Amino acid sequence: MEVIELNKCTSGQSFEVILKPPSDPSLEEIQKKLEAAEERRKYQEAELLKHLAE
Amino acid sequence: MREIVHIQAGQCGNQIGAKFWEVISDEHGIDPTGSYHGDSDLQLERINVYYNEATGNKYVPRAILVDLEPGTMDSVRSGPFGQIFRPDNFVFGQSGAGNNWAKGHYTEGAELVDSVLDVVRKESESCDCLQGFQLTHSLGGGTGSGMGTLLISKIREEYPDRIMNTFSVMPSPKVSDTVVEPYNATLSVHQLVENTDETYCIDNEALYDICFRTLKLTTPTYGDLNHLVSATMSGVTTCLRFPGQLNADLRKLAVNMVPFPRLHFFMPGFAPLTSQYRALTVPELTQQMFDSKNMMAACDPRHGRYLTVAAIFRGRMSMKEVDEQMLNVQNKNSSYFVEWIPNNVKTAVCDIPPRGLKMSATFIGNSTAIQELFKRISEQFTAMFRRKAFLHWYTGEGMDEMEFTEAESNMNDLVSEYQQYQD
Amino acid sequence: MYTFVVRDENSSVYAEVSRLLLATGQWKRLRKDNPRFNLMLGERNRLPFGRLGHEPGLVQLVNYYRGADKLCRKASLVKLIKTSPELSESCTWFPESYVIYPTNLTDEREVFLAAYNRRREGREGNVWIAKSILISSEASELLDFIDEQGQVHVIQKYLEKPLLLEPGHRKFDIRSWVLVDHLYNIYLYREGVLRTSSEPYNSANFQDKTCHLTNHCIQKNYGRYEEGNEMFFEEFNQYLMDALNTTLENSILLQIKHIIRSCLMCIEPAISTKHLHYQSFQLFGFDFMVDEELKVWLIEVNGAPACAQKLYAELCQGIVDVAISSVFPLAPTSIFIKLHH
Amino acid sequence: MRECISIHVGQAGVQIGNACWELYCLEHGIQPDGQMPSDKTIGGGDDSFNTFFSETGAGKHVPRAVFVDLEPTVIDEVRTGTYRQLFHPEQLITGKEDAANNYARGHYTIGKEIIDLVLDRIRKLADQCTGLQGFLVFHSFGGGTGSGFTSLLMERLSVDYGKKSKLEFSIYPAPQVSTAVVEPYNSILTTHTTLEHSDCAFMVDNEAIYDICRRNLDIERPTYTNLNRLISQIVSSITASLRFDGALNVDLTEFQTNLVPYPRIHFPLATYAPVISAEKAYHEQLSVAEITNACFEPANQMVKCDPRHGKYMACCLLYRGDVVPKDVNAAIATIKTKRSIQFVDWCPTGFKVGINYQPPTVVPGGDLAKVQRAVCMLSNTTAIAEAWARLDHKFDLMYAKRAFVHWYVGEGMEEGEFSEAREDMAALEKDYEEVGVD
Numbered sequence A: 001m002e003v004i005e006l007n008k009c010t011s012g013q014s015f016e017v018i019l020k021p022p023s024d025p026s027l028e029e030i031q032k033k034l035e036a037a038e039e040r041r042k043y044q045e046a047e048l049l050k051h052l053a054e
Numbered sequence B: 001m002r003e004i005v006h007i008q009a010g011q012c013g014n015q016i017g018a019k020f021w022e023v024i025s026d027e028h029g030i031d032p033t034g035s036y037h038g039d040s041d042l043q044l045e046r047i048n049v050y051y052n053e054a055t056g057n058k059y060v061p062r063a064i065l066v067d068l069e070p071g072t073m074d075s076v077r078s079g080p081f082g083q084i085f086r087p088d089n090f091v092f093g094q095s096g097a098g099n100n101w102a103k104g105h106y107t108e109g110a111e112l113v114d115s116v117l118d119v120v121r122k123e124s125e126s127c128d129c130l131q132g133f134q135l136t137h138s139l140g141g142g143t144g145s146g147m148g149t150l151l152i153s154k155i156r157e158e159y160p161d162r163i164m165n166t167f168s169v170m171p172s173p174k175v176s177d178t179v180v181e182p183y184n185a186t187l188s189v190h191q192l193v194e195n196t197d198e199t200y201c202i203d204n205e206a207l208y209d210i211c212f213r214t215l216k217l218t219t220p221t222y223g224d225l226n227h228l229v230s231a232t233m234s235g236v237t238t239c240l241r242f243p244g245q246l247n248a249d250l251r252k253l254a255v256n257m258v259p260f261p262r263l264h265f266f267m268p269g270f271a272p273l274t275s276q277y278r279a280l281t282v283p284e285l286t287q288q289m290f291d292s293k294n295m296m297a298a299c300d301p302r303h304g305r306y307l308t309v310a311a312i313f314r315g316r317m318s319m320k321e322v323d324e325q326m327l328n329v330q331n332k333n334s335s336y337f338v339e340w341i342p343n344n345v346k347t348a349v350c351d352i353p354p355r356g357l358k359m360s361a362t363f364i365g366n367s368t369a370i371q372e373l374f375k376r377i378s379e380q381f382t383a384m385f386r387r388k389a390f391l392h393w394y395t396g397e398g399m400d401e402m403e404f405t406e407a408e409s410n411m412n413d414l415v416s417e418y419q420q421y422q423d
Numbered sequence C: 001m002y003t004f005v006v007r008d009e010n011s012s013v014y015a016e017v018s019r020l021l022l023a024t025g026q027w028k029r030l031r032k033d034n035p036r037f038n039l040m041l042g043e044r045n046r047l048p049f050g051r052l053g054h055e056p057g058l059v060q061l062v063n064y065y066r067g068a069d070k071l072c073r074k075a076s077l078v079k080l081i082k083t084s085p086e087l088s089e090s091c092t093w094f095p096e097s098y099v100i101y102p103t104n105l106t107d108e109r110e111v112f113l114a115a116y117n118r119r120r121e122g123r124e125g126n127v128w129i130a131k132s133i134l135i136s137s138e139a140s141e142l143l144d145f146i147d148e149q150g151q152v153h154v155i156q157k158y159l160e161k162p163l164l165l166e167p168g169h170r171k172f173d174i175r176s177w178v179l180v181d182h183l184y185n186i187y188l189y190r191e192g193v194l195r196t197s198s199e200p201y202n203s204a205n206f207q208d209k210t211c212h213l214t215n216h217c218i219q220k221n222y223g224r225y226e227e228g229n230e231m232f233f234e235e236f237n238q239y240l241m242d243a244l245n246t247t248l249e250n251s252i253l254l255q256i257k258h259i260i261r262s263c264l265m266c267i268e269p270a271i272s273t274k275h276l277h278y279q280s281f282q283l284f285g286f287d288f289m290v291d292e293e294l295k296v297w298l299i300e301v302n303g304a305p306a307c308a309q310k311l312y313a314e315l316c317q318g319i320v321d322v323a324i325s326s327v328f329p330l331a332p333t334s335i336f337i338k339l340h341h
Numbered sequence D: 001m002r003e004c005i006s007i008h009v010g011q012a013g014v015q016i017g018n019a020c021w022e023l024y025c026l027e028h029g030i031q032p033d034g035q036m037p038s039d040k041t042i043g044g045g046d047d048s049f050n051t052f053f054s055e056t057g058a059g060k061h062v063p064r065a066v067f068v069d070l071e072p073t074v075i076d077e078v079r080t081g082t083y084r085q086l087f088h089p090e091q092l093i094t095g096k097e098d099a100a101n102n103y104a105r106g107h108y109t110i111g112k113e114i115i116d117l118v119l120d121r122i123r124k125l126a127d128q129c130t131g132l133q134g135f136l137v138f139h140s141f142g143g144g145t146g147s148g149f150t151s152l153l154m155e156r157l158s159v160d161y162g163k164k165s166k167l168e169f170s171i172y173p174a175p176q177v178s179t180a181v182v183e184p185y186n187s188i189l190t191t192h193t194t195l196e197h198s199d200c201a202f203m204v205d206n207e208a209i210y211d212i213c214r215r216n217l218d219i220e221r222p223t224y225t226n227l228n229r230l231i232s233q234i235v236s237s238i239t240a241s242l243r244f245d246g247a248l249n250v251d252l253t254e255f256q257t258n259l260v261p262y263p264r265i266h267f268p269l270a271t272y273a274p275v276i277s278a279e280k281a282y283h284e285q286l287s288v289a290e291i292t293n294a295c296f297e298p299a300n301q302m303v304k305c306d307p308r309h310g311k312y313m314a315c316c317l318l319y320r321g322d323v324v325p326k327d328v329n330a331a332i333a334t335i336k337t338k339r340s341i342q343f344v345d346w347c348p349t350g351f352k353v354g355i356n357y358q359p360p361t362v363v364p365g366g367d368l369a370k371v372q373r374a375v376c377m378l379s380n381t382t383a384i385a386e387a388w389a390r391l392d393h394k395f396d397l398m399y400a401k402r403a404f405v406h407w408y409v410g411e412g413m414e415e416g417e418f419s420e421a422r423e424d425m426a427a428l429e430k431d432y433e434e435v436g437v438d
């Protein structure tokens, strides 16, 4: 039960009490995922428009 | 500004659509001439969802009336709220469809469809953000069934990413105009399976039994049946027409109601239905809402299981008590709800009750018990088709038996699909 | 109409409890995977406590106390007693025990040998017993047997002077069932059972563990003196009066009630559900030893105990009354003894 | 002085952001028009509140915040609300149609078409920062925008501000105040792609906030306003050290240092007390020990779980009000002897304490009562993994049948990302059990 690093200022204070000691994707890769998903949608909608034209 | 374009096709579609606009127009404070004379701002809050705003603070429904004969739409334009519809939005022919799906879909309907799309295109272009389309129609006739699905397939080509909802009246021999209704209904169901996001199945037999047994009406009429459809159409669209949270728009309702694309056929339910001054408690609204007698598809929910449910309570009530009774129904019948979709029963509250009711409840169910509705149609269909009876009405319009076999096969698959998820 | 689920098909105790529930016409059983349940008769291992108490409008209950394993594990019980100031290392009703990990894996090997050596020099009885069974007086045999295995073991003193029944000169042990409800009332079933050894106790041969281990399976002279080597409190009480001139309540029952209170009241802050989003109850089986001085010792604690065949009805009916209906009431002369605290 | 930019995404993010900035102004004495009579350095300054408020020559204090929603109805409230004058139009961004509770729709379909814009608006606020520390992102797990677009934003922020920290305040889904059935899907999808991009994430379970409002405030049917006023109180406690003079958690980096010894285990549990009803006749003011003891009651945690059955990696006590260090230690020593606080062996058994003398502020007319002293505890327990377990269970129930999966595939997402995200959760749950189980 020890207190350490007691800091005090006009607006408050902080301290630490110890009881016991111890024992990414690039901008390119992102723009690819996005366009891939946009392409799979374009393919799905093209198959629908092809189905409707038939 | 999430607008919806409404379409009503055929005799049944326009007679029910007329009553629908008569009901909500009253709820939103719009008189037969399109002038607003309400007292609450909640009415106008989401008024642009169904109504356009013309010069002079006028509100004109965003509705398109379609038919192949002038008889029915002439009555609408001469009816109560006849003057409210945009005069240009009446599109009709003189030939008729003779209760023939082929005529509505391939011959007579093909001649008139292009001029209907010119009106749809006009209404959509004026929409700041078009949600989608809703269509009221019967499946047993010729125009609403045959041309109705033709409009859906053609509108889909032009607005493929919007939402398509239908209120579809299913035929029953107990309330029959012609023997060919099963043919038309089966041909349409195939279309709806592929082209709509949501279809509210309104079985004329359920409506009949409710009028005869529950409402104690000795001789039900189409007028009496259309009253129940009005009350239900008003209830199921309350989520869209007033300031709310869940199922606020068409795509969001679909996301929470449709777990599998082909299984988008709902059983609507309404409460109360009195044969009338007594107050209805919250427990009573809930027991009646889920009771089969109050359901309008004529499918006993105790025969299947609910994939998802959307409940709506209208009026000034205890939202705390609403949550209690809802949880009570689910917990007291958890064997009729699939256990592999957590929290699949959603409830919404609205403070504006329907005309003449202190409070009410509208029920939207996606139950596998709807499969029995398609079983009736399939049995009635094959009874005539195995003898090729009455096919000449259709083959004489350019169709082929193969097209009938295909529609039949797709509906049987739909049934088998419901069956596997019921287990 | 309350709902419950069954997740332990092998629980004879709750198989009967579930039978009685359905017999009341007010409890409906659901599929074992249905979450809209009021009561859960859960599995033994890996019971998913983290999913309880998160169903709106549902008061959920379960037949196990999360954390109770600290009391129902050979190694965990030893560590709990030694480290809990409530029980302390000087606990008088618990045999001197030690946690010994096999050499193929803290550990208490050296601490165990310090006491063992002290006895070997003090001419005192140095007969120990390891388990997780081998009884031996040489520490070399005990430690060498745990190494041949690959799981944690515990070496505790063997009661060389156990109380022997007559006629027969035979060992025994006592089983008490203890139900702790959602409020943490400690109820002790008025009916215990003594699992006796049908073989005369022989202190000069620990190789034949038939007269030393009183388990109903090992024994099963079976059924000679009493049916199924099982003696109940009525006969055992009359025996203590005829032989020793004392009652079961005075000579033994006071100590058992003390031991049960101490153990449960100690881990109460760790397992209580008084402020939890779900509620817990659990049935316990305490096993005791009695020596020729009428002093009671704590053998172990069982977290999923079975019940004596003759008492399944009465006790199971009791589990429903004070543990299940106390939370979900239905529309005496209690069989339990409340250990107040 | 180092600046902090707040980003509010989706309805839950925006509305909660409205509650916090309302409270921030009431605390720092900033009126709805942006004026601050106490700021004697007009048009500038390097004070503590400047980390959250920019300054114009006219003396207005503008929040360093950006609001993003794919549907314009929730942010239109801000544009015409009480604090409409606080923000300039550049800070409020809105689209036409939302993500419809569809993670794929918010991440791919709609997100791809508005991601470069939001970044350009953030870049505008960054340019006003002379020493930007990082970002605080508010969003829901269940919403299509809060989940889908947030994770896309988090990736871009890591690319455009790789050296800056990022903190999340995430709303965990609760069926009692939710109607979307697919929120388990979105929750786990957003956690997978956002995990490697977040430094410290505070989860708020709506079920916890809901029960606190009914139990402590006597709100039979709480509304989002009730929930958000309470949530912003906890957020104020957590962000107070960045906005006021002090020495504990002085910058966003310190949050990771003090609360996250293991990078993948960066979800601290928050506990707050006391929550007293303003409608209460009058409450007896609780002491340091009673409110500190209350921090170990599950009933005031932001996420229901049982810390008694996990292990602590870090514990941080943040007091506001009449609190002296002497009383804090007197309460801690009282709780160690009663509570079951097991720490991981590789972490020291200890508590970092921060005390701010100004007591909590309460929005006039709100639901909370003025209290003399309040504490918020930030503890890193392995017990919070219970919330992932619950969420994972619901995911598996639906994915086994592929229920609703077609909505995501229809927005261009591949089905594989489901199991990819789920496997990452199975990995997250394995790290938690390696830390707090023997």
Ligand SMILES: Nc1nc2c(ncn2[C@@H]2O[C@H](COP(=O)(O)OP(=O)(O)OP(=O)(O)O)[C@@H](O)[C@H]2O)c(=O)[nH]1
Pocket: D009, D010, D011, D012, D013, D015, D016, D070, D071, D098, D099, D100, D101, D102, D106, D140, D141, D142, D143, D144, D145, D146, D147, D171, D172, D173, D174, D177, D178, D179, D183, D206, D224, D227, D228, D231
């Ligand atoms: N605490 C709190 N939770 C909210 C709030 N608003 C929504 N939620 C929760 O957030 C979840 C829904 O996500 P939203 O934020 O509404 O969705 P979104 O980010 O706007 O994305 P969209 O799907 O495009 O509308 C539900 O679980 C709600 O309970 C709020 O104001 N406060």
Ligand SMILES: Nc1ncnc2c1ncn2[C@@H]1O[C@H](COP(=O)(O)OP(=O)(O)CP(=O)(O)O)[C@@H](O)[C@H]1O
Pocket: C095, C129, C131, C156, C157, C158, C159, C160, C171, C172, C173, C212, C213, C214, C215, C287, C299, C300, C302
């Ligand atoms: N310290 C000790 N001294 C003497 N005998 C002991 C002893 N510990 C256990 N025994 C004997 O072993 C039996 C208890 O064994 P234990 O309970 O450890 O095995 P077990 O758990 O498989 C049976 P249960 O769990 O059902 O009681 C008692 O009947 C007793 O005779």
Ligand SMILES: Nc1nc2c(ncn2[C@@H]2O[C@H](COP(=O)(O)OP(=O)(O)O)[C@@H](O)[C@H]2O)c(=O)[nH]1
Pocket: B009, B010, B011, B012, B013, B015, B016, B097, B098, B099, B100, B138, B139, B140, B141, B142, B143, B144, B145, B169, B170, B171, B172, B175, B176, B177, B181, B204, B207, B222, B223, B225, B226, B229
């Ligand atoms: N509920 C209801 N059903 C109707 C109404 N009119 C017709 N029907 C049903 O619809 C089918 C006839 O379709 P109909 O609308 O006349 O065909 P259409 O004019 O070619 O579109 C039959 O099954 C009738 O039972 C009505 O007003 N209400």
Ligand SMILES: CC(=O)N1CCC(NCCc2ccccc2)CC1
Pocket: B133, B152, B153, B155, B156, B157, B159, B160, B161, B162, B163, B164, B193, B194, B195, B196, B197, B261, B262, B264
């Ligand atoms: C999943 C599923 O059932 N689908 C069928 C419904 C489809 N959306 C509606 C298409 C539309 C749009 C405008 C007019 C008419 C039709 C999506 C796929």
Ligand SMILES: [Ca+2]
Pocket: B111
């Ligand atoms: Ca012609």
Ligand SMILES: [Ca+2]
Pocket: D039, D040, D041, D042, D043, D044, D045, D046, D047, D055
């Ligand atoms: Ca300044």
Ligand SMILES: [Ca+2]
Pocket: A024, D158, D162, D196, D197
């Ligand atoms: Ca990073």
Ligand SMILES: [Mg+2]
Pocket: B011, B099, B141, B177
């Ligand atoms: Mg007709």
Ligand SMILES: [Mg+2]
Pocket: C300, C301, C302
């Ligand atoms: Mg045992």
Ligand SMILES: [Mg+2]
Pocket: D010, D011, D071, D098, D143, D145
């Ligand atoms: Mg939204």
